[PDB]
Design a protein around this nucleic acid. Sequence first.
DNA 1: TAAAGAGCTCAGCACTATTACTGAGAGTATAAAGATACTGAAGCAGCC
Length: 46
Amino acid sequence: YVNNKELLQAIIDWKTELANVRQNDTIGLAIMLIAEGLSKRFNFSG
DNA sequence: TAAAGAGCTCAGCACTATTACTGAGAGTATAAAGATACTGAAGCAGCC
């Protein structure tokens, strides 16, 4: 799906900003992505 | 002797405080996981 590392980056960055409102959606798109990919796991998707 | 006091405490309907107790919530950091048939109607598509 998606490089875990870049996600660490984005979230570190929203950490730093929340240390000041919203967050980037890059990480949010990736979240949708990973949710939907897990959905196709084998116990579920049944 | 026996009708008649005044009270000693036991059925019989609540009440408040209770006690499991079921629900709402908040933590979660390995993975990449298909054998109708027909008619019709606008839209699309090429043309002088």
